[PDB]
Swiss-Prot record, chain A:
Residues 7-237 are annotated as: RNase H homology domain. It is found in: Nucleus. The chain holds residues 1836 to 2069 of 2413 of the full protein. Changing residue 21 to N: Reduced growth at 30 degrees Celsius. Strongly reduced growth at 16 degrees Celsius. It comes from the Eukaryota. Functions as a scaffold that mediates the ordered assembly of spliceosomal proteins and snRNAs. Required for association of BRR2 with the spliceosomal U5 snRNP, and the subsequent assembly of the U4/U6-U5 tri-snRNP complex. Functions as a scaffold that positions spliceosomal U2, U5 and U6 snRNAs at splice sites on pre-mRNA substrates, so that splicing can occur. Interacts with both the 5' and the 3' splice site, as well as the branch region. Has a role in branch site-3' splice site selection. Associates with the branch site-3' splice 3'-exon region. Also has a role in cell cycle. This is Pre-mRNA-splicing factor 8. Changing residue 22 to A: Reduced growth at 30 degrees Celsius. Strongly reduced growth at 16 degrees Celsius. Strongly reduced growth at 35 degrees Celsius. Disulfide bonds: none annotated. Component of the U4/U6-U5 tri-snRNP complex composed of the U4, U6 and U5 snRNAs and at least PRP3, PRP4, PRP6, PRP8, PRP18, PRP31, PRP38, SNU13, SNU23, SNU66, SNU114, SPP381, SMB1, SMD1, SMD2, SMD3, SMX2, SMX3, LSM2, LSM3, LSM4, LSM5, LSM6, LSM7, LSM8, BRR2 and DIB1. It comes from Saccharomyces cerevisiae (strain ATCC 204508 / S288c) (Baker's yeast). The lineage of its organism: Eukaryota, Fungi, Dikarya, Ascomycota, Saccharomycotina.
Swiss-Prot record, chain B:
Heterodimer. Interacts with PRP8 (via RNase H homology domain and MPN domain), competing with BRR2 for the same binding site. Component of a U5 snRNP complex that contains at least the U5 snRNA, PRP8, SNU114, AAR2, SMB1, SMD1, SMD2, SMD3, SME1, SMX2 and SMX3, but is not a component of the U4/U6-U5 tri-snRNP complex. It comes from the Eukaryota. This is A1 cistron-splicing factor AAR2. InterPro entries: AAR2 (IPR007946), AAR2_C (IPR033648), AAR2_C_sf (IPR038514), Aar2_N (IPR033647), AAR2_N_sf (IPR038516). Residues 244-265 are annotated as: Leucine-zipper. Its main location: cytoplasm. Belongs to the AAR2 family. The modification Phosphothreonine is found at residue 257. GO terms for biological process: spliceosomal snRNP assembly; spliceosomal tri-snRNP complex assembly. The modification Phosphoserine is found at residue 236. It is found in: Cytoplasm; Nucleus. Present with 7330 molecules/cell in log phase SD medium.
């Protein structure tokens, strides 16, 4: 059924699974028209499809052309997400196909179930985890490939860089969720934490800086401090 | 007008005949039901006084044979049987009528209720849903499961309703996932009407039979099928106008006949609220909407 804190270790077992987050598929700016009505302008979006064990991220870029002349875009976005995840599964060799797809939003369950009828043994599950994958577009290299896209595109990333050489997938996923939660909560403060020391750079082939094990402990502590600082600001606590 | 004699009534029982019901006492001199209107199917149903477990009964058409009821003390129920000997059957009915040992089917002349509830129901379609080819009548009870319930277990004692499943390859054309899931017209018109039922009369017959088995036996699978067949039409943007008008009449008489005190067990809130207020056909069921809002406004 639903994936929670109880069954957290299940994310890091040897059963292939993907998270799907659709929160950045349909993205708009809202503005006044000349007549003083309000209009939306779509911007490029993405499907965030992640294997939490390996770090492999299937970033399907959703180009604004897919919305042209379409109605009920927020509804269509869910079905387009399901169509693209289905197409990704069919593209993978059998031994690489997931046994489970965990959607971050319960509104994706029916669209994905209906697109995946041909795969009755792939479980489609919701989660009680509040995962900050909406903040993917705060990772500069992901935002850059999405905004520059002139057509539909799939780009493959490892969202853990080389961390799995040194840490477990449990710890890598914990680090990722903490960084994304910090970027979601105060983007400018989180990027300043990550970039403030100019001697630590991001490798051409990485998303995150090249922190030593001791520096990651410092960074993680600074991110927890940011989140707690912001909770205190929010609630006056 | 036809007759179903009873050999005897050895156990106290509530006997239903269509929408009517009568209490018979243990060893009461009761010998059956006369004046049954020719031209409709009928159902004769039982609930024992000493064990309200198993409602059960028989669908029949007096045009198809001479039927009687006899209690079986081994299997503990009233069984329908066919009398093949015409002169014996006439002689038995004559004796019991002469002695006024039969209740009369209590039809009011102005009252079309039973026709309204069975307009599309045919014995030959009943005998394909309930498979016992050696009898011309069909046994149904409270506990019989449907082929659909059995998939999600004795296949011989099952109700073979047409399987309806909105999240199935049958319901959804590859490449038309959103279209077919949000608008069930493909599934209703191509798969179900053109493909399986051949016409709206057969589809409505099955819907009506499902409702009657839900109401008379408290058969849960039957209630599921009835609601699924309503939802499939209401969730279709493209439905022939005659079918919508006919569905409004069918549902009106079903909601009119439902016992007020069974509405909590016989009516699915989600389906009715969706069908009357959200669906493509929310504005197409004026008579059904009016009776539902006046009789069961708590459900809505």
């Amino acid at each position: 059924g639903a994936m929670n804190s109880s069954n957290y270790a299940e994310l890091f077992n040897n059963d292939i699974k993907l998270f799907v987050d659709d929160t950045n598929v349909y993205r708009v700016t809202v503005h006044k028209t000349f007549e003083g009505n309000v209009a939306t302008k779509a911007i490029n979006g993405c499907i965030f499809t992640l294997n939490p064990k390996t770090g492999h991220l299937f970033l399907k870029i959703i180009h604004t052309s897919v919305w042209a002349g379409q109605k009920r875009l927020s509804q269509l976005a869910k079905w387009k997400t399901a169509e693209e995840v289905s197409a990704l599964v069919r593209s993978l060799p059998k031994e690489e196909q997931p046994k489970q797809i965990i959607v971050t939003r319960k509104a994706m369950l029916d669209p994905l179930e209906v697109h995946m009828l041909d795969f009755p043994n792939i479980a489609i599950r919701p989660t009680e985890l509040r995962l900050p994958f909406s903040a993917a577009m705060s990772i500069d290299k992901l935002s850059d490939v999405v905004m520059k896209a002139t057509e539909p595109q799939m780009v493959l990333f490892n969202i853990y860089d080389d961390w799995l050489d040194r840490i477990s997938s449990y710890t890598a996923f914990s680090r990722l969720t903490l960084l994304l939660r910090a970027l979601k909560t105060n983007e400018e403060s989180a990027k300043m934490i990550l970039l403030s020391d100019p001697t630590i750079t991001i490798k051409s082939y990485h998303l995150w800086p090249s922190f030593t094990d001791e520096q990651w402990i410092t960074i993680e502590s600074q991110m927890r401090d940011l989140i707690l600082t912001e909770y205190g600001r929010k609630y006056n606590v | 007008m036809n007759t179903v004699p009873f050999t005897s009534a050895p156990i106290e029982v509530t006997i239903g005949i269509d929408q009517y019901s009568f209490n018979v006492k243990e060893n009461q001199p009761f010998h059956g039901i006369k004046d049954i209107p020719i031209g409709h199917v009928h159902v004769i149903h039982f609930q024992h006084a000493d064990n309200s477990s198993m409602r059960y009964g028989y669908w029949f058409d007096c045009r198809m044979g001479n039927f009687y009821i006899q209690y079986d003390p081994k299997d503990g129920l009233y069984k329908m049987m066919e009398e093949r000997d015409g002169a014996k059957f006439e002689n038995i009915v004559h004796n019991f009528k002469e002695r006024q040992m039969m209740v009369s089917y209590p039809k009011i002349d102005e009252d079309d209720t039973w026709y309204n509830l069975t307009e599309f129901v045919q014995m030959d379609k009943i005998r394909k849903i309930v498979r016992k080819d050696e009898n011309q009548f069909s046994y149904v009870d409270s506990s019989m499961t449907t082929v659909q319930e059995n998939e999600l277990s004795d296949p011989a004692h099952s109700l073979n309703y047409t399987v309806i499943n909105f999240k199935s390859r049958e319901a959804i054309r590859p490449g038309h996932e959103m279209e077919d899931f949000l608008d069930k017209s493909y599934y209703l018109n191509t798969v179900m009407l053109q493909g399986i039922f051949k016409n709206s009369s057969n589809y409505f017959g099955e819907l009506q039979f499902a409702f009657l088995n839900a109401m008379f036996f408290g058969n849960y699978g039957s209630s599921l099928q009835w609601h699924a067949m309503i939802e499939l039409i209401c969730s279709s943007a493209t439905v022939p106008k005659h079918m919508l008008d006919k569905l409004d009449e069918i549902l009106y008489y079903q909601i009119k006949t439902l016992p007020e005190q069974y509405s909590d067990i016989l009516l699915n809130e989600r389906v009715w609220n969706i069908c009357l207020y959200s669906s493509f056909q929310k504005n197409s069921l004026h008579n059904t909407e009016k009776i539902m809002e006046n009789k069961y406004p708590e459900l809505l």
